Design a protein around this nucleic acid. Structure first.
Lengths: 177, 76, 63, 88
RNA sequence: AAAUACCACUACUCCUAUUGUUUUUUUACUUAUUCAAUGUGAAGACAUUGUCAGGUGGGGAGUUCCUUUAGUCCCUCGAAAUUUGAGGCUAGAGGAGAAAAGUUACCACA
């Protein structure tokens, strides 16, 4: 493994602040004098406890395949892409939320965009290109993405209309099987 | 913040009560141990610290606006 | 310990708080499996009916 | 439109200092960010550019002030580490 | 699998007692030790600390090992008893250097 560099952590925190509300909560120290850290193994970043990372160093580089929760990967062009594996953190501290009925929840898992015919609840005053985590009617985190229009435009929108751009969904777990 | 104009101004004016909520949550224990609690039309100037605590708790848990949107984590 | 210099009371309070923490950890250890459904309180109405106040860490300290 | 990283554009000295440049196509030392203080500094900066324009002057002052506090704490931590590794 | 009469041995498992050795846990106390002061107090057998053996090392300084193949049934190491698996020997094949690089009948855009 290797800790993130300053620019790499700047990029990762830019994306994380795009999708989440508070981040000092993530990097806050815990009761037992332990804290969460960020590490990179084979152009993947992993959110993991410092104790777990320090006990995972005994593993040789070629043999470490996972550690904690995989947030995403840094691409060859130097940009961070977030993952459905990083969805749980997003659910914990999400900024904007979008609830979808079953009729759109199943398509969202199949890998389709969210539609006004699917939306069942909004978050008031959501700007155009903002960070919204997609849940179902049972408050179960289903995915995350960036919304298409604002709340007013979505309300005025044709019900057969795109309201959210899909970026990651729980169906990729059915892929990596 | 429960004022109507301020309630609609909320997001645009960037008015976050997170500090006040956290301070109340952290001070609950010291207030519980404080023995001076019951030594005592108006909306603010109330002489009893218990009454002030009740008003804060009503504001945080049972708000005039968005009563059924309160975070379940906060409620619990 | 940032008051006075009253070390005997300091030590006595340290021992008391230690015992309090130990007894708190004891009850929670034996609490885990106690079904307290709102319409079923048999287990909680039994908790430790079969223990006496010298077995708890606070009981030992107080005696 | 083509990237200034693609083009071999020399760095120019402005009000913002160029600083100690490094040779091209060589080892640029990785400064690892792992301290909570540096994390706080970066995180506060990111939140500042994300929130952006705030109507209230005290709001602006407090955002800039928390960034300044994070930077001071980070610098103090590095100075303490330097003294530790120099004497002991 | 193993066959009981007869008499010879040692193999483990569970209890007991004293005519004894060590090791570990809990607790008690200061003399090991930790903290404060100057022209003695508190803490405490745990910490902290030290040494050898290793694991990792995308960070710092310096310089330009495993896997497969065939053979002798040659040695060791494990394992089941009437045999194996892993190392070892011989010589073919795999793995300027943290900056980045190579590649694809794939993808999006131009």
């Amino acid at each position: 493994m290797r800790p993130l560099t300053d620019q790499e952590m700047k990029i990762v925190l830019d994306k994380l602040a795009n999708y989440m509300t508070d981040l000092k909560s993530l990097i806050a120290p815990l009761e037992d004098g332990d804290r969460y850290v960020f590490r990179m193994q084979k152009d993947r970043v992993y959110y993991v406890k410092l104790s777990i990372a320090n006990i995972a160093t005994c593993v040789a580089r070629d043999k470490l395949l996972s550690l904690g929760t995989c947030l995403g990967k840094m691409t060859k062009s130097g940009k961070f892409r977030l993952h459905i594996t990083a969805l749980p953190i997003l659910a914990q501290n999400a900024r904007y939320k979008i609830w979808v009925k079953d009729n759109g929840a199943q398509p969202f898992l199949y890998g389709s965009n969210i539609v006004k015919a699917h939306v069942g609840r909004w978050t008031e005053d959501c700007p155009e290109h903002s960070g919204c985590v997609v849940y179902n009617m049972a408050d179960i985190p289903l995915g995350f993405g960036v919304t298409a229009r604002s709340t007013a435009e979505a309300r005025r929108l044709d019900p057969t209309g795109i309201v959210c751009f899909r970026q990651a969904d729980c169906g990729e777990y059915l892929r990596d099987e | 913040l429960e004022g109507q104009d301020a309630h609609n101004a909320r997001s645009d004016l960037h008015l976050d009560l997170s500090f006040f909520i956290t301070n109340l949550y952290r001070s609950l224990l010291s207030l519980s141990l404080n023995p001076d609690l019951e030594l005592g039309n108006n909306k603010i100037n109330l002489q009893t610290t218990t009454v002030l605590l009740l008003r804060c708790l009503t504001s945080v848990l049972l708000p005039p606006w968005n009563i059924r949107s309160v975070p379940p984590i906060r409620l619990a | 310990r940032k008051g006075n210099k009253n070390a005997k009371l300091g030590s006595s309070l340290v021992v008391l708080v230690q015992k309090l923490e130990m007894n708190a950890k004891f009850i929670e250890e034996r609490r885990a499996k106690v079904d307290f459904a709102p319409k079923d309180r048999a287990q909680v109405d039994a908790f430790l009916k079969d223990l006496e106040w010298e077995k708890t860490p606070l009981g030992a300290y107080v005696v | 439109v083509y990237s200034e990283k693609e083009l071999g554009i020399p760095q120019l000295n402005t009000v913002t200092p160029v600083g100690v440049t490094k040779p091209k196509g060589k080892k640029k030392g990785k400064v690892f960010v792992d301290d909570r203080e540096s994390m706080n500094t970066i995180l506060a900066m990111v939140e500042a550019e994300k929130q952006g324009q705030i109507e209230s002057k005290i709001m602006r002052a407090r955002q800039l002030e928390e960034i300044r506090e994070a930077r001071r704490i980070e610098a103090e931590k590095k100075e303490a580490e330097r003294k530790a590794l120099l004497e002991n």
